[PDB]
Structures are given as structure tokens and as C-alpha cells.
Design a protein around this ligand. Structure first.
Ligand code: PXP
Ligand code: PXP
Lengths: 242, 238
């Protein structure tokens, strides 16, 4: 019931790729973040490599002193890289139109067989697999039949809610989905759009295992530095579960 | 003696526009930078607004406590905007394939019209150019009181001979331009590791530095990043 913090460092790479320079280097961030209270490091290797690159992935795997979480699209190219690099975690996410739901989560249920097989290959090599899904009982069932030990619930709707009633409903949607996922024996993560100002209610949920969080941290980091930004998110998360 | 630092806060916005968010906000980066030793704030308003927006310029205009330097291409729309906003400086810069530094010599009449309109509403105008004597003269011909010498090639020198050769080209251009009455700025590609030879050149009025500053910032914080860059610049002129 200590909630874990995964720091996603893609946007360090966004800043880098904007020029073709060597800095800022995601590898440096990983060290800052872990020693400031991150429990894991996340990177999304996109097919287009718009931020994180193969160069990044291959070095991070040798330098992450915690657990590495590799977010990737469900493709044969990416399942190969994953089965080579062997991160502690994989998190399967959509990147194409045909793989995503209206809401932004991975369509596990529309492509069950593709999922099961991807999972199978990752697991056979010791990786633990998460599917980033909506707070949806049907997608949850799919992930179980997929054999994915973990899910990550998409906190976007929860983040973007304009009004008090909307926020409440989205929150209850996540709450119920976490309770259900766990019932069916899934370990439950959450992420997308979490900030220094909306994290607590998500943090407070008993079932949440790890929160995955990138942009807000990187965004605070340019002003105050990543060590401060990570510690402050970790503090809010601790306080949320008092 | 004294060397000014203009901090280009463009890539704060690179970070924000990636998502649809409000943070990180260039408005804040400006207070931080100004207060940790920047002497001016530079932003480049692209026609494509891929980083800095009009919202940004509008607010900055009212929040900046030092002086604003607006980087822009030579278009009717951009000159109109800069006539409204009235920054202390304007830096003219290539953006399209038809505009390396600006080709002032190739387009001296256009640059003269543009320099003219900006300077008629009190703007100090700077032309961003290669360290080329010819472009320096075209600048003087167009009326611009400032040049900024492009330091890209220097920053990219991959061999020691290439580096010295780019450094002297910059040194000689600064010397010559100052010998034609220009105020000489420099910029593009300056880091904590290559700034001092440029800082060292007696002619330099202001260094305009962005990316390397934002790049260090996400690690160490904006304030320290700005301050350390300032120190390097002071130490260079000892
Ligand atoms: C599955 C998942 N979780 C978390 C995040 C990070 O969300 P944010 O950057 O909005 O905190 C992302 C974005 O890469 C993601 O794809
Ligand atoms: C005219 C000019 N000067 C200076 C800079 C700063 O260059 P850097 O961000 O590489 O320090 C830029 C980049 O926007 C520029 O366009």
C-alpha cells in the first residue's frame, strides 16, 4: 500500500530532438529521478522515434537502477526489441487509429488474439505486461483473457473534466474499474494527465499499485529542476494515503 | 568590458505545445531568467507558431522587466505585429527557403524597407547573418544598428582546426563590423562548454542563448542554469 511512482522521461527527449544535440539526455534524467524518489522509469519508444530513441532504450536498460518500464505499440518490431532488452515492465499502448478506442485506451477487446500472443512472447522472456486501458469492464475482461498480469487505467477523462460533477463521475469510473480489475486478480496502475493538482484523489485509491506520470513532472522540472519535481510528486502521493 | 546575456525562452514552449497544456509557461521562465542574471528575453514568433504563440508575446510584453527581443522573419504580418507590440529589439532571421544567416546582400532593398519601418516606431533592429564581410556591409547599407553573428558552424566544428577556423572568422567579423559602427551580437549553438571563446571577443555586445540553457534547466532548474551561464560570460572577459 505504498503507492509507487513511475517517472516517464519522454519529454526530456522531446527537448533534445528539437535540435540534433546530445543534451538533455534522458539517461541523466533517469538517475536524477530515481534518486529523488522514483520507483521506476518509463519510456515510450514510438515507431517514429519522435522522442525516445533505440539509443536511449539500450543505454537506459543498462543504467536504470530501479525497474524499467517500456511503453510500446503492439507490433512485431516492438515485441522483438522488448524481448531483446527485457525491461522489467512493458506497457502496451495504442499509436494507430485502428488500435485505439474513442477514449484513448488500447482496444484490447477488438484484438484479443493479437494481444494474447504479444503478451505470451513478452512473458516467456520474464517481462511483466500491462495494457493501458480505459476504465471499462469489457476492456478489463479482455486483458485478463489476454493473460496480462497488469493494467494501467487511462486517467485522461479524469484530468480534462471541466466541472465538479464531471470530475466526480470520471473519478468514480476509475474507482469502480480499479475495484473490478483487482477482483479479477489484476495489479492496477494509472496514468495520463496526472499533475501536482489532481494526483491525490487517484493516489488515494487502495488498489492503485503504481502511478505513471511524465509531462507534469518534466514541466515542473524546467523551472525547479527534476530532483525537486520528482520529490514533490512523491510527497503528494505519500500524503494522499494518510 | 560588459557582456549582456539574452535568454531565448522558445523551448520552454517546445515543452508545453507537445501537449495542449498551460505549463510550462514562457511567462514564468522570463521572470526566472531575468532574475538569475539574463539582461533581456528573446522569443521567436514563427509564422507557424510552433513554440511561442501571440498569447505568449502579448503577456510577455506586459511582464518582462528587462527588455524584449522579438525574433521574426521579414514578412508584412510580422512587421505589423512588431509595430503593435513594440519590443526594445527586433532580430530579423531567415525562416523560409528564400531567406545560415539572413541574405541581406542578396535582398538589400527589402531589408532596407523592413529595417526602416521597424526603426520608425523606435525599434532597435538586428540582422542575423553569417560572419561575412559582404553581409556585414549589406547590413550597414540597410541601416540596421545591430548584427547578430551566427555561431552555428563554430558550435558544430568537429575538429580543432575547424573550430579555430570558425572562431577566427567570427573574431574577424566582429572586429570588422565594430569597425563599421555596428553593435555586434552573437548566437546559435552556444553552450557552457563553447561560450567562453565567443564571450572573450572584445567586440561582443550581447549573446543570445536558448536551447543549451533550457537543456540544462530540466536537469538543474532554470535559475541555476541562467546564473551559471552568466558566470561563464563574466569569467571570459577577465
Ligand atoms: C500509458 C501511459 N501512461 C502515462 C503516460 C504519461 O502521461 P503524462 O505525460 O500525461 O503524465 C503516457 C504518455 O506517454 C502513457 O502512454
Ligand atoms: C537569431 C537567433 N539567435 C540566437 C538563438 C539562440 O540559439 P540557441 O537556442 O541554439 O542558443 C536563435 C535560435 O532561436 C536565433 O534564432
Amino acid at each position: 500500500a505504498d503507492l509507487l511512482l513511475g517517472v516517464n522521461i519522454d519529454h526530456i527527449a522531446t527537448l533534445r530532438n528539437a535540435r540534433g544535440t546530445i543534451y538533455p539526455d534522458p539517461v541523466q534524467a533517469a538517475f536524477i529521478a530515481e534518486q529523488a524518489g522514483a520507483d521506476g522509469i518509463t519510456v515510450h519508444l514510438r515507431e517514429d522515434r519522435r522522442h525516445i530513441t533505440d539509443r536511449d532504450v539500450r543505454i537506459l536498460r543498462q543504467t536504470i537502477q530501479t525497474r524499467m518500464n517500456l511503453e510500446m505499440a503492439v507490433t512485431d518490431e516492438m515485441v522483438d526489441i522488448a524481448c531483446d532488452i527485457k525491461p522489467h515492465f512493458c506497457c502496451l499502448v495504442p499509436e494507430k487509429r485502428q488500435e485505439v478506442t474513442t477514449e484513448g485506451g488500447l482496444d484490447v477487446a477488438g484484438q484479443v488474439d493479437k494481444m494474447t500472443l504479444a503478451v505470451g512472447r513478452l512473458a516467456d522472456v520474464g517481462i511483466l505486461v500491462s495494457l493501458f486501458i480505459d476504465a471499462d469492464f469489457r476492456q478489463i475482461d479482455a486483458a485478463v483473457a489476454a493473460g496480462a498480469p497488469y493494467i494501467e487505467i487511462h486517467t485522461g477523462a479524469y484530468a480534462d473534466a471541466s466541472t465538479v460533477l464531471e470530475r466526480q463521475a470520471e473519478l468514480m469510473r476509475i474507482a469502480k474499474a480499479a475495484t473490478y480489475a483487482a477482483g479479477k486478480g489484476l495489479k492496477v496502475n494509472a496514468g495520463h494527465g496526472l499533475t501536482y493538482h489532481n494526483v491525490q484523489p487517484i493516489a488515494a485509491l487502495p488498489e492503485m499499485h503504481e502511478l505513471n506520470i511524465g509531462h507534469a513532472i518534466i514541466g515542473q522540472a524546467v523551472m525547479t529542476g527534476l530532483a525537486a519535481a520528482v520529490t514533490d510528486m512523491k510527497v503528494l502521493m505519500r500524503e494522499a494515503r494518510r
